[PDB]
Amino acid sequence: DVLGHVRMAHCNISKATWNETLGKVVKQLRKHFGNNTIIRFAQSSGGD
Amino acid sequence: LTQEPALSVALGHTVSMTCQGDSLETYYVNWFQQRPGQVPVLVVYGNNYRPSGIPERFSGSWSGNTGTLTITAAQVEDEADYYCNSWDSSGTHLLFGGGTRLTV
Amino acid sequence: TLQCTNYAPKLRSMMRGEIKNCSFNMTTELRDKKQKVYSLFYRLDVVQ
Amino acid sequence: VQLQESGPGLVKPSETLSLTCIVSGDSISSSEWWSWIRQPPGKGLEWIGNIGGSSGSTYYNASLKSRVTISKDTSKNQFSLELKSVTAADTAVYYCARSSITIFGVVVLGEVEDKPLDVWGRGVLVTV
Ligand SMILES: *[C@@H]1O[C@H](CO)[C@@H](O[C@@H]2O[C@H](CO)[C@@H](O[C@@H]3O[C@H](CO[C@H]4O[C@H](CO)[C@@H](O)[C@H](O)[C@@H]4O)[C@@H](O)[C@H](O[C@H]4O[C@H](CO)[C@@H](O)[C@H](O)[C@@H]4O[C@H]4O[C@H](CO)[C@@H](O)[C@H](O)[C@@H]4O)[C@@H]3O)[C@H](O)[C@H]2NC(C)=O)[C@H](O)[C@H]1NC(C)=O
Ligand SMILES: *[C@@H]1O[C@H](CO)[C@@H](O[C@@H]2O[C@H](CO)[C@@H](O[C@@H]3O[C@H](CO)[C@@H](O)[C@H](O)[C@@H]3O)[C@H](O)[C@H]2NC(C)=O)[C@H](O)[C@H]1NC(C)=O
Ligand SMILES: *[C@@H]1O[C@H](CO)[C@@H](O[C@@H]2O[C@H](CO)[C@@H](O)[C@H](O)[C@H]2NC(C)=O)[C@H](O)[C@H]1NC(C)=O
Ligand SMILES: *[C@@H]1O[C@H](CO)[C@@H](O)[C@H](O)[C@H]1NC(C)=O
Ligand SMILES: *[C@@H]1O[C@H](CO)[C@@H](O)[C@H](O)[C@H]1NC(C)=O
Ligand SMILES: *[C@@H]1O[C@H](CO)[C@@H](O)[C@H](O)[C@H]1NC(C)=O
Ligand SMILES: *[C@@H]1O[C@H](CO)[C@@H](O)[C@H](O)[C@H]1NC(C)=O
C-alpha cells in the first residue's frame, strides 16, 4: 500500500546555475564550431 | 445520477444515503446539505474530506460507482435536503442528483 | 497471467494510471498449494 | 470570503435577465472556478454554467447553453450571467459560487485536488 497520497518522483535543478553552466558549455563548443554558429540544445528523440 | 428520494430516521440514529452513477468511476462524490430556505453548503468533498465547520457525524465512501454519506446518530439540526454532486465524464462540471429528503 | 486494475482510479496528477493493482496465484512452499497475492506494479513494468 | 448577488428581480417573458455577482475579501484572478447555479422552488441545485477566474475559459449546461452567456470583469472583481429569452422555467433562485483547489504535492505535476463549491453567496430570487 501507499501510506498517503500517490506522488510522482522528480528532480530539482536550480535554473540560474544550469543557465550559467550551459552558457559555459556553449562557449567551449563555439571554440570548435565557430564564433557565429548558432548552438541549439534539444531533447533526445528516438530510442527506448 | 440517481439517489434515494427520501429517508426516514428516528432522532439519534445513524443514516446512510447512497447515490449511483457512471461518472463516479473517475470522479469523487461531493455531498451537499441544504436546509429548506437556507443557502446550501459543502458537507463531504474529494477523498472523504470534511470541510471545517461540519460536525464529525458526516462521513462517507466512494467505493465502486456509488457514493455514500453516513451521518452517525443523526440530529434534528441535520434535517435538510442532501445532494450527491459530481462532474460529468465529458468534463462538464454538472451531474447532480435529484436529492434525498431526509426526515429525522 | 495477472489481473489488474488501477491503483488510484481517481487521481489527476501525472501518476494517473502509473500504478496498477494486480492479482495473481503465484506458488507456495508446498507444491500442492496456491495462494492469492495482490501487489502494486508500475505501468512501465507491465505489458497488456 | 463573502459573495453577494443582485439583479432585475421581476422580468417579463422573452426579456433578457442580467445578474451580477460581487465579492468581498478575494480576487477573481486566482486559479479558481466561478459558477452560476439555478434552483427553482421545487427542484435541486441545477448548475447554469461557469467561468475560470484566471483564464476566462467557460463551460455551460448543454440544455441551456445556446441562450446563456457568462462573463467576468477582472476590474471590480465582478461576474455576470446574461440569460436570453427568459421563460416561466427561470422563476428560480440564482446563486453564484466558487470552487477551490487544494495542494498536497507539486503544483506543476498536477498534484492538486478539487473542492468544487467552497463558498456560496446568498443568491437572488427572480420572477418572470
Ligand atoms: C522542487 O521544487 C518544488 C517547488 O518548485 C517543490 O514543490 C513544493 O513541495 C512542497 C512539499 O514538499 C509543497 O508544499 C505543500 O504546499 C501546500 C500549499 O501550501 C499552502 O498552504 C500552506 C499551509 O501551511 C502555506 O504555508 C503555504 O504558504 C501555501 O499557502 C500545502 O497544503 C502542503 O501541505 C500539506 O501536506 C503537508 C505534508 O507535509 C502536510 O503537513 C500539510 O498539513 C498539508 O496536508 C494535506 O493533507 C492533510 C491530510 O490530513 C489535509 O488535512 C491538508 O488539508 C492537506 O490537504 C505542502 O505544504 C509545495 O507547495 C510545492 N511547491 C510547488 C510550487 O509545487 C518540490 O518539493 C521540490 N523538490 C525537491 C526534491 O527539492
Ligand atoms: C440543465 O441541465 C439539466 C440536465 O443535467 C436539466 O435538468 C433537467 O430538467 C428537467 C426539467 O424539469 C427535468 O425534468 C423533470 O424531472 C422531474 C424529476 O422529479 C419530473 O418530476 C418532471 O416532470 C420533469 O420530468 C429533468 O429531470 C432534469 N434532469 C436532470 C436534473 O438530470 C436542467 O433543466 C438544465 N437547466 C436548464 C435551465 O435548462
Ligand atoms: C487491490 O484491490 C483489491 C480489491 O480488488 C483490494 O482488496 C480489497 O481491500 C478492501 C479494503 O480496502 C477489502 O474490504 C476487500 O475485501 C479486499 N478484496 C479482496 C478480494 O481481498 C486490495 O487491497 C488492493 N490492493 C491494495 C494494495 O490496496
Ligand atoms: C538541494 O537541497 C539542499 C539542502 O539539502 C539545498 O540547499 C539546495 O538548494 C537544494 N537544491 C535544489 C536545486 O533545490
Ligand atoms: C540565461 O537565460 C536567458 C533566457 O532568455 C538567455 O537569454 C541567457 O543567454 C542565459 N544565460 C545567461 C548567462 O544569462
Ligand atoms: C573567436 O573569438 C576569439 C576571441 O575571444 C578569437 O580569438 C577567435 O579567433 C575567434 N574565432 C573566429 C573563428 O572568429
Ligand atoms: C487463480 O487460480 C484460480 C484457479 O484455482 C483462478 O480461478 C483465478 O482466476 C486465478 N487468479 C488470477 C488472478 O488469475
Secondary structure of D49-61 as H, E, C letters: EEEECCCCCEEEC
Residue D10 has which C-alpha cell? 421581476
Q: Which of A28, A31, A35 to probe ligand 6 with, by most ligand atoms within 8 A of CB?
A: A35
Nearest Cα neighbor of D97 from D42, D40, D26, D41 is D26
Q: Is A5 exposed, middle or buried (0-12, 13-18, 19+ CB in 10 A)?
A: middle
Q: Which residue, C47, C48, C22, is CA-closest to C37?
A: C22
Looking up cell 470541510, which residue turns up? B51
What is the distance, to the nearest Å, from the Cα of residue C7 to the centroid of all Cα atoms in its chain?
A: 9
Q: By the 8 A CB rule, do B59 and B48 touch?
A: yes
Q: Which residues of B64-103 are buried (b: 16+ CB within 10 A; e: fewer)?
A: eebbbbbbeebeeebbbbbbbbbbbeeebbbbbbbbbebe
Identify the H or E element spanning B75: none
Cβ atoms within 10 Å, residue D52: 16
CA of C3 to the centre of ligand 7 (A): 9
Q: Which of D86, D117, D60 is nearest to D7 (CA)?
A: D86
- Distance, in Å, from the CA atom of D124 to the CA atom of D47, rounded to the nearest integer, reads 15
Distances (CA, A) of D105 to A7, A34, C9, D79, D110: 7, 45, 18, 31, 8
Q: Which helix (H) or strand (E) holds D80?
A: strand D78-83
Counting every residue, how long is chain B? 104
- Which residue of chain C is at minimal alpha-carbon distance from B62? C10
Q: What's the Cα-to-Cα distance from C29 to each of C26, C33, C36, rounded to whole Å?
A: 11, 8, 14
- The angle subtended at Cα D45 by Cα D41 and Cα D49, nearest 5°, is 120
DSSP symbol at B48: T
Please report the atom of ligand 4 found closest to the CA of residue A14.
13
Question: Is the shortest distance between the CB of D38 and ligand 2 below 6 Å?
Answer: yes
Chains that touch A (3 or more CB pairs under 8 A): C, D
Residue D92: count of CB within 10 angstroms of its CB: 20
Q: Which residues are registered as beta bridge partners of B7? A: B102
Q: At which residue does the C-alpha cell 463558498 appear?
A: D119
Reading the block at residue B11, the C-alpha cell is 432522532
Q: How many beta-carbon pairs below 8 A join chains C and D?
A: 12
Element (H, E) at C21: strand C19-24
Triad B54, B56, B60: Cα angle to 5°: 95
Whether residue B96 contacts residue B85, with contact meaning beta carbons closer than 8 Å, is answered with yes
Please tell me what DSSP assigns to residue D20: E
Cell of B22: 457512471
Q: CA-CA distance, D59 to D114, in Å (whole number)?
A: 16
Q: How remote is the C-alpha of A1 from its chain's centroid?
A: 35
Q: Long-range CB contacts (< 8 A, 24+ apart) of D106-113?
A: D106/A7, D106/A8, D106/A10, D109/A7, D109/A8, D109/A10, D109/C13, D109/C14, D110/C12, D110/C13, D110/C14, D111/A5, D111/A7, D111/A8, D111/C13, D111/C14, D112/C12, D112/C13, D113/B46, D113/B47, D113/B49, D113/C12
* Residue D31 to residue D105: CA distance in whole angstroms: 16
D109 contact C CB<8A:
yes
Distance (angstroms) between ligand 3 centre and the Cα of B16 equals 22
The tally of CA atoms less than 13 A away on the side-chain side of residue B89 is 8
Q: Which amino acid is at D96?
A: C
- Cα–Cα distance measured from residue C19 to residue A7, given in angstroms and rounded to the nearest whole number: 11
**Contact assessment for residue D59 and residue B93, using Cβ atoms and an 8 Å cutoff:** yes
Provide the CB-side half-sphere exposure for C30 (13 A, CA): 4
